[PDB]
Amino acid sequence: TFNMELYNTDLFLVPSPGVFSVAENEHVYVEVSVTKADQDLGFAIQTCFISPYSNPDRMSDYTIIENICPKDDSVKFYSSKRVHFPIPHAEVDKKRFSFVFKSVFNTSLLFLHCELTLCSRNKGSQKLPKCVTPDDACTTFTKPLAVVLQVD
C-alpha cells in the first residue's frame, strides 16, 4: 500500500533494481507513493534521514526533512502525481524530491528512512490532520519506510 522508489534521473522513469549505489555529490531521486480508495485522503513527507541502521529508534543527525520541512538545502521538490486505476477503483498518490548525497558514515551500507504522514485533503476535519505542503510547513496516521543505499 506504501512505496518508496529510487531513480537514477529526475524523470522518475526507471527505478533502481534493488540497492541503489551512490557517491558523494550525486543526486538521489526519491518517490513515495500511497495506494488507496478514499479520494479525500492525502499524505505528506514528514521526516527523512540517512542512517546506518535498519532501525529508526536510533534516529540520526543526517536529517533531510523534519516535520515536513526540508532541513538539507540540497533538497528539491517535484510535481506530485495522482494516477487512477480505472477498473479497481483506486488511486496512487506519488510525491517526489531529490537531494545531493554526502558520505559521512563509517560504513558503506546505509538506509534512507522516510516516514509518511496521512492527512485529509478536504477542509473541516477533526478526524485527521488537514494536509500541508513542504515550505508552507516551514511557514498514528504515520508510516515508516526504508530503502537501502550503497556508497562508492
Author numbering: 591 to 729, 745 to 757
Sentences from the paper on this structure:
The mouse TGFR-3-ZP protein was crystallized in the presence of the endoglycosidase F3 under the assumption that in situ deglycosylation facilitates crystallization. The intervening loop segments (termed AB, BC, CC’, …) differ considerably in size and in case of loop FG also contains a small α-helical segment termed αFG.With the exception of strand G (residues 745 to 757 in murine TGFR-3, see below) the structure compares well to the corresponding rat ZP-C fragment, which was used as a search model during molecular replacement. Unexpectedly, the amino acid registration of strand G is shifted by four residues in murine ZP-C when compared to the corresponding segment in rat ZP-C. We therefore conclude that the shift in the registration of strand G, which contains the EHP sequence, constitutes a genuine difference between both structures.
Transforming growth factor-β receptor type 3 (TGFR-3), also known as betaglycan, is an ubiquitously expressed cell surface proteoglycan that serves as a co-receptor for members of the TGF-β family of cystein knot growth factors, i.e. TGF-βs, activins, inhibins, growth differentiation factors (GDFs) and the bone morphogenetic proteins (BMPs).
